[PDB]
Amino acid sequence: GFHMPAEWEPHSQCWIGWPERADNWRDGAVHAQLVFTRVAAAISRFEKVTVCASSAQWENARNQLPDHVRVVEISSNDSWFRDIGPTFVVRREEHRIAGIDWTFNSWGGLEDGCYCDWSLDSLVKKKILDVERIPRFSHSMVLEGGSIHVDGEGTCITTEECLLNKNRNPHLSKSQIEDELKAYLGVRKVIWLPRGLYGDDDTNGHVDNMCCFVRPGAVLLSWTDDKTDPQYERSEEAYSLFSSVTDANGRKFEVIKLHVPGPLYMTEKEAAGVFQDDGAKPRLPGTRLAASYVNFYIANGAIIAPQFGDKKWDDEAIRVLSKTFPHHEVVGIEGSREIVLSGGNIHCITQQQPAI
Amino acid sequence: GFHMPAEWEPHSQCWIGWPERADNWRDGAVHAQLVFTRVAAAISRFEKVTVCASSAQWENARNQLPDHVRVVEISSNDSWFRDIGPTFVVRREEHRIAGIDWTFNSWGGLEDGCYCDWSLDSLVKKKILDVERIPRFSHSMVLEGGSIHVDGEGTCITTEECLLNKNRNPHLSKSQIEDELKAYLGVRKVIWLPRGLYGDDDTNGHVDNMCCFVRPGAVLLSWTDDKTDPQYERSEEAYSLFSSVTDANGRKFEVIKLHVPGPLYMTEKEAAGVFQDDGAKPRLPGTRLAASYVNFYIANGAIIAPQFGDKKWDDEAIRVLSKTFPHHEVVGIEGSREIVLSGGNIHCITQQQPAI
Ligand SMILES: NCCCCCC(N)=O
Ligand code: NA
Ligand code: NA
């Protein structure tokens, strides 16, 4: 009787890593640390937070973060807890909470991943559940928490582009992958968007950059009105798909558009501050960033939302999110661009722990 | 209104470190790891245990330890949590528990300490209390938990050999030192044994290796019958002091003698197992081991006692302890010699967290 609750359901805390690697984070992560800190501090106005930092970084993190934020020493290859963190499941009313330890392979493994070493990334789920004394359900299937979303009422959305990629689970068919999601997330229906966001070659189109539930029966969808942008056809396809399906309880989808910023491109400055290495992916100037306002975190009573420094769409997204979540305080995080330069945003760096 | 409760009072958990440094533990610590495992398994029969291992050892510790033992990642320079973990204090009838973060300096600093780098060790207290979300009282005075003992009724016992060494707090008088113990452990009287155990030049004579309370107004004392042994005059002297002095409530001290084993000396095999490095104290053959059954741990209704493989005195200690602690299950830990080779025993590697 375990299932994954919706993100907007109450949490007891939020887990976040701490960026440090010089080959992914410009200027040895100094810029990224400031934003991580702003995100943690914002979330901690609404729910407890634990940031996890390496040995070498523990003091830095402790120094930057207010005291009501807990800092623990957990090493990682990189700081993306949405994907390397456990996925918590609950059984409400004698263990009422547990965590799923999905196999992690750096978003594509030796042939098509981001780093050739992920052995510390792989232990993060175990380590966290050990700190909390929460039971771990281990799974040999490759999965990242960024690649699924739920409504806590039986429905899951995901993308084919990610989950059906041969760099993940080449041994499993689509319908075998679906059976695992249903068994382990406690859902009875999976909606497969064909594609994620244009330009998300890091993760191969994680759904959490393209689409998310905001309540039972309604989703936000990354969108552009520019039919010359390669995003348009993906967004249109997903929109049609949502018109044709219903959720696990038979609701018609209310689709709410959320216009992407930019498009945004890495500068020569931004590329130049990243140390170059032959065990990481070479970040080049002119690369299109995979930027969507959809990559936000729902905290108890607040939406923690990206701002990329594109004023028109930064302001429009705050407006859409304020009306979409009328009972939440919406807090935009200036400097989110510093996270998208390295492959993700606010939702990618968080992992909620549901209250029981 | 905080005070240090006595060791025999109820605990919520025990903290232990994980040995790894090969310049102190023979054969890269493989012998000691087996013993710490045994010690933690034994304690875990009576109270929740958390072992703390570095990143490089986390999997190894998690493998060796039973599932009901929590394993977290807290790196340290060495694994002596009596001295480098926090000293918990409580306030009975709003925060009811806190920890004291004494300054640590590797048992005598750059000049006379055990290793030249202790900066990981210095953070262990912060980190443990951060994990537990327990307030921390910072203290600038150098002190080790091993150098003090309390009855939980206003009395403290320690040694001048340790606390009045110029390698600890050279700018404080005896009186100033005594003031800080009173304010911070909530004791009204401090008994100063002049000396600890012979050959304990690591710690400069921790009381936890010489003498401990059994109950208010009663103590076990490290003892030999051999008056040709250097230990005799130290023991004799301490015995004398207990005849003369009273506790904080003006009770007289029942003393119970506990015969030391050996003398024990480090084999050639033992010394050669240890890697030779300049930043740690060079372990030489023929060196007298600072062994004493007094270095035991009181868990919730158990006594976790050393056994050094010197059967005469091994059996005698269990006897004396089962007698002295008739409401407690005594538990001997074969292989305790592996710990003493690196300069402490069971008491030295534990740190109780009082239940509130
Ligand atoms: N370089 C890997 C970036 C991870 C982004 C995760 C996500 N939730 O889309
Ligand atoms: Na990839
Ligand atoms: Na010393």
Side-chain angles (χ1 to χ4, degrees), chain B residues 52-259:
Chain B
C52 300
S54 65
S55 189
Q57 285 291 327
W58 193 92
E59 284 183 276
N60 169 34
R62 177 68 281 167
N63 174 63
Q64 290 199 44
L65 289 162
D67 294 323
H68 65 279
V69 170
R70 173 177 70 166
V71 178
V72 308
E73 183 190 327
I74 292 186
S75 61
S76 58
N77 300 102
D78 206 351
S79 57
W80 302 104
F81 272 35
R82 177 62 54 187
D83 300 345
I84 78 188
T87 302
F88 290 95
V89 294
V90 290
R91 153 159 62 92
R92 287 118 184 195
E93 327 203 353
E94 306 154 4
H95 271 299
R96 280 188 298 145
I97 180 164
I100 304 161
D101 182 354
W102 307 104
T103 302
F104 175 69
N105 76 346
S106 207
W107 307 277
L110 283 169
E111 292 97 323
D112 211 20
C114 290
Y115 41 73
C116 72
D117 176 10
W118 57 86
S119 60
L120 294 177
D121 283 344
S122 281
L123 300 169
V124 168
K125 303 190 198 73
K126 274 155 143 286
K127 276 164 178 181
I128 288 190
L129 299 159
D130 218 316
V131 166
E132 285 303 290
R133 280 165 177 122
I134 289 176
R136 173 178 73 99
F137 296 138
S138 202
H139 210 299
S140 73
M141 183 176 68
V142 173
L143 196 76
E144 298 103 43
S147 68
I148 52 83
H149 264 310
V150 298
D151 67 349
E153 301 200 333
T155 319
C156 180
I157 302 175
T158 177
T159 72
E160 297 177 337
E161 182 186 344
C162 185
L163 264 62
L164 307 188
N165 200 301
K166 80 215 199 79
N167 74 13
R168 292 316 208 281
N169 294 292
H171 303 287
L172 305 178
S173 69
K174 181 170 170 153
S175 189
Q176 278 163 315
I177 292 167
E178 187 177 328
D179 283 352
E180 306 290 344
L181 306 173
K182 286 170 172 178
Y184 271 90
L185 310 182
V187 293
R188 296 175 312 281
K189 181 176 202 179
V190 174
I191 310 310
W192 296 85
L193 276 42
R195 288 176 299 171
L197 207 82
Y198 182 70
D200 191 1
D201 300 322
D202 272 14
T203 67
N204 304 108
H206 274 189
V207 73
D208 81 340
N209 236 6
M210 187 58 147
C211 184
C212 66
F213 282 102
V214 167
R215 58 168 176 272
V219 309
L220 287 145
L221 166 71
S222 276
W223 191 262
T224 190
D225 282 319
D226 181 343
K227 294 137 83 57
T228 70
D229 202 275
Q231 181 57 42
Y232 180 87
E233 54 166 6
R234 290 163 170 261
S235 287
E236 200 299 302
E237 184 183 31
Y239 192 85
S240 253
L241 190 48
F242 282 119
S243 299
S244 80
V245 84
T246 67
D247 83 4
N249 302 320
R251 288 167 289 189
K252 177 203 296 169
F253 284 92
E254 189 201 68
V255 173
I256 306 171
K257 293 159 175 198
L258 189 68
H259 207 282

Side-chain angles (χ1 to χ4, degrees), chain A residues 320-336:
Chain A
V320 170
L321 287 167
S322 303
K323 78 184 292 172
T324 301
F325 293 97
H327 312 300
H328 296 58
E329 162 170 353
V330 177
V331 185
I333 300 297
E334 321 297 317
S336 291

Side-chain angles (χ1 to χ4, degrees), chain A residues 106-108 112-114 167-168 201-204 281:
Chain A
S106 197
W107 313 272
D112 196 26
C114 289
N167 73 3
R168 296 315 215 280
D201 313 338
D202 268 25
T203 67
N204 306 104
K281 254 185 53 171

Side-chain angles (χ1 to χ4, degrees), chain A residues 13 48-50 53-55 58-59 62 67-75 120 123 126-127 130-133, chain B residues 13 48-50 54-55 58-59 62 67-75 119-120 123 126-127 130-133:
Chain A
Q13 66 181 327
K48 294 182 159 156
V49 170
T50 305
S54 69
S55 191
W58 188 93
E59 293 202 77
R62 178 66 289 165
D67 268 344
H68 61 279
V69 175
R70 174 172 74 161
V71 186
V72 303
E73 178 186 354
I74 288 166
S75 60
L120 295 170
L123 298 171
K126 267 187 106 154
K127 280 168 181 190
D130 213 325
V131 165
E132 288 301 293
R133 296 183 169 96
Chain B
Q13 90 188 302
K48 299 200 273 121
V49 175
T50 304
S54 65
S55 189
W58 193 92
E59 284 183 276
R62 177 68 281 167
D67 294 323
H68 65 279
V69 170
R70 173 177 70 166
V71 178
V72 308
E73 183 190 327
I74 292 186
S75 61
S119 60
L120 294 177
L123 300 169
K126 274 155 143 286
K127 276 164 178 181
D130 218 316
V131 166
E132 285 303 290
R133 280 165 177 122

Side-chain angles (χ1 to χ4, degrees), chain A residues 7 212 220 293-298 303-306 321 325 347:
Chain A
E7 197 171 296
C212 70
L220 283 162
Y293 292 101
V294 161
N295 205 262
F296 59 86
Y297 179 69
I298 305 170
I303 304 296
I304 315 293
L321 287 167
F325 293 97
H347 192 252

Side-chain angles (χ1 to χ4, degrees), chain A residues 218-265:
Chain A
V219 300
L220 283 162
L221 179 62
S222 306
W223 187 266
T224 183
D225 284 318
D226 186 2
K227 295 180 153 58
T228 69
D229 190 81
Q231 179 61 39
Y232 178 91
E233 63 164 283
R234 284 156 178 255
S235 295
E236 183 182 52
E237 168 179 55
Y239 190 93
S240 303
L241 178 73
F242 281 119
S243 297
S244 78
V245 303
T246 62
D247 76 353
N249 275 57
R251 300 180 181 93
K252 198 208 329 288
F253 281 98
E254 172 187 353
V255 179
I256 305 154
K257 294 164 177 198
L258 193 58
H259 197 293
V260 294
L264 311 185
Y265 302 98

